[PDB]
Amino acid sequence: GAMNSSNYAELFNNDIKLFVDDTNVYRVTVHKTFEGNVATKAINGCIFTLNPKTGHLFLKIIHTSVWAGQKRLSQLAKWKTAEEVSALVRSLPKEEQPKQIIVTRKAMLDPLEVHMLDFPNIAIRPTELRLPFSAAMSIDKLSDVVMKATEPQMVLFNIYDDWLDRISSYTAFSRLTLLLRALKTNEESAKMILLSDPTITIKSYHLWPSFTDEQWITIESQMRDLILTEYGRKYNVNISALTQTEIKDIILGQN
Amino acid sequence: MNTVPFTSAPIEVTIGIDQYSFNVKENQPFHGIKDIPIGHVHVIHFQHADNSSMRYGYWFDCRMGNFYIQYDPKDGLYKMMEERDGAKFENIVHNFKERQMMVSYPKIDEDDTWYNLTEFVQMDKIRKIVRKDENQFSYVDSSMTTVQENELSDPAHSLNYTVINFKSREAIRPGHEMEDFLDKSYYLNTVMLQGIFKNSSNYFGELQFAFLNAMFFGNYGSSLQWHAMIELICSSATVPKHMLDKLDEILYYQIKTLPEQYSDILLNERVWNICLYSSFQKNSLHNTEKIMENKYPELL
Numbered sequence A: 001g002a003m004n005s006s007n008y009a010e011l012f013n014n015d016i017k018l019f020v021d022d023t024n025v026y027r028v029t030v031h032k033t034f035e036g037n038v039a040t041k042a043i044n045g046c047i048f049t050l051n052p053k054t055g056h057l058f059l060k061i062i063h064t065s066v067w068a069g070q071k072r073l074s075q076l077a078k079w080k081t082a083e084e085v086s087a088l089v090r091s092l093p094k095e096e097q098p099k100q101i102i103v104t105r106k107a108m109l110d111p112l113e114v115h116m117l118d119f120p121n122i123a124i125r126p127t128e129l130r131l132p133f134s135a136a137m138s139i140d141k142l143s144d145v146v147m148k149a150t151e152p153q154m155v156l157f158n159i160y161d162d163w164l165d166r167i168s169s170y171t172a173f174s175r176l177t178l179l180l181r182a183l184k185t186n187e188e189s190a191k192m193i194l195l196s197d198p199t200i201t202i203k204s205y206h207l208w209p210s211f212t213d214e215q216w217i218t219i220e221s222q223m224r225d226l227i228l229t230e231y232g233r234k235y236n237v238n239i240s241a242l243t244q245t246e247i248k249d250i251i252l253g254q255n
Numbered sequence B: 001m002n003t004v005p006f007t008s009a010p011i012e013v014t015i016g017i018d019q020y021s022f023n024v025k026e027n028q029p030f031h032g033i034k035d036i037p038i039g040h041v042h043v044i045h046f047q048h049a050d051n052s053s054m055r056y057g058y059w060f061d062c063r064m065g066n067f068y069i070q071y072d073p074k075d076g077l078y079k080m081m082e083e084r085d086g087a088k089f090e091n092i093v094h095n096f097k098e099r100q101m102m103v104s105y106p107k108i109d110e111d112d113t114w115y116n117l118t119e120f121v122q123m124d125k126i127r128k129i130v131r132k133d134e135n136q137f138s139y140v141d142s143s144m145t146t147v148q149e150n151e152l153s154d155p156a157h158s159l160n161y162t163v164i165n166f167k168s169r170e171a172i173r174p175g176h177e178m179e180d181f182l183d184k185s186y187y188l189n190t191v192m193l194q195g196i197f198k199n200s201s202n203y204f205g206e207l208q209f210a211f212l213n214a215m216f217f218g219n220y221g222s223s224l225q226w227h228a229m230i231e232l233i234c235s236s237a238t239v240p241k242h243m244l245d246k247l248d249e250i251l252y253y254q255i256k257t258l259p260e261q262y263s264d265i266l267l268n269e270r271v272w273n274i275c276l277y278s279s280f281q282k283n284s285l286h287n288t289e290k291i292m293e294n295k296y297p298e299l300l
């Protein structure tokens, strides 16, 4: 069925599963035409397909050529997403195929179910969590590979870098969702927090900076503060009056 | 005009004959139904006065034999039977008409309702849906499940309607997933019509039989089947013009005949709003849309 707060731990069990987010598949800029009308220009997008236990990210780059000459692009994008996730599953050895695919948006359910009819034993599920995977395009190295692509392309990343050598996947997913939520709420400030310190760098084969455990605790704190700060700026709330119980709920409530 | 003789009516019962109904009291001098129009299938149905549970009944065609009803006190129901002895049959039949112990099938001459509800319903096709080959008539009741219901339990006592499932490999061509799901023309025209039903007449007969079993017995699986067969057509962009026009007529008479007080349970709000206002055929069902909007505007 649906995935929510009652079954958080199921994401980090040994049943292979993937999250599929389609929010960056069909991307456009809206602009005025010479005649004063409005038109869209597509730009490259990506499917965000993630194993939350391992960090493996199957990033299918959606080149703008896939939209050429097509109608009803927002509808097509859901089916294109489903087609590509299906092709990925079929490309994987049987013992690597997922037992469950969790879609972040319920509009993906029927497209993916239909494309996966050949896999009756793979469960297609929605989720009540509001996961911030849209902010993936705020990770500089992901945004770069998407915008530079001149053709359809699949790129593989581990979105946890080497974190799993030191922390569990429940903690790694918590860190990733906190980072993505912050980048989604205030991207400039989140990148400022992450990159303000020259002495901490991003390894060539990593997405995030090489923080020590203690620095990650500092970074995570600065991200919660950013989420709380924006929360107050948004609703005109004096954050100083807020209690720790109120804060957990505000930050936890965002996802 | 043909006759269905009742040995007797030992228990108080509401008797249906097609779209008509009448009450018979416990041990009342009732010996059956006369003047039944030759040329149509018919349904004789029952609801016991002391236990409205289990409506049940028999589809039959008087051209296929001489049929009568006799109560079975062991199984507790009015059973249809066939009388092979033609002269015994005509003889008993004549005795009860001479005594006026029968109700007359009450067909008004202006009225084409029954024809318009059963135009495409054939006894031979009923007997493939309701499997009991030793009898020429077919028993249906309120609780019988459909083959699809059993997939989602006794197989001998099931309604073997044609399985329709929009998220099935039969409905969806590999490589045409979005096309086939958003426009069901392939599934309707190639899989169902050409492949399974062979022609639209057989498709409509199943649709009409499913409607009648939903209406007369409150058979839920039949109601599901009737709505699936409507939705399949309405969700196809390419339907022969003659099928659309016939479907409009078929549905018009069905909505016209439905008891107003059963509309909340026999009409699926989602399916009808989709079909009438969002589907490819939203503008092709003029008569059905007009009667629906004037008779059941709440549902929409």
Ligand SMILES: C[C@H]1CN(C(=O)Cc2ccsc2)CCO1
Pocket: A008, A011, A129, A170, A171, A173, A174, A177, A178, A181, A251, A252, A253, A254, A255
């Ligand atoms: C382990 C948990 C992590 N989670 C979160 O969303 C945590 C979170 C909430 C607000 S900012 C970060 C999704 C379910 O699994």
Ligand SMILES: C[C@H]1CN(C(=O)Cc2ccsc2)CCO1
Pocket: B005, B006, B007, B008, B068, B069, B070, B083, B088, B089, B092, B093
């Ligand atoms: C066998 C029984 C049948 N019965 C009936 O009344 C029912 C009947 C009518 C025509 S054929 C059967 C009278 C005595 O003979």
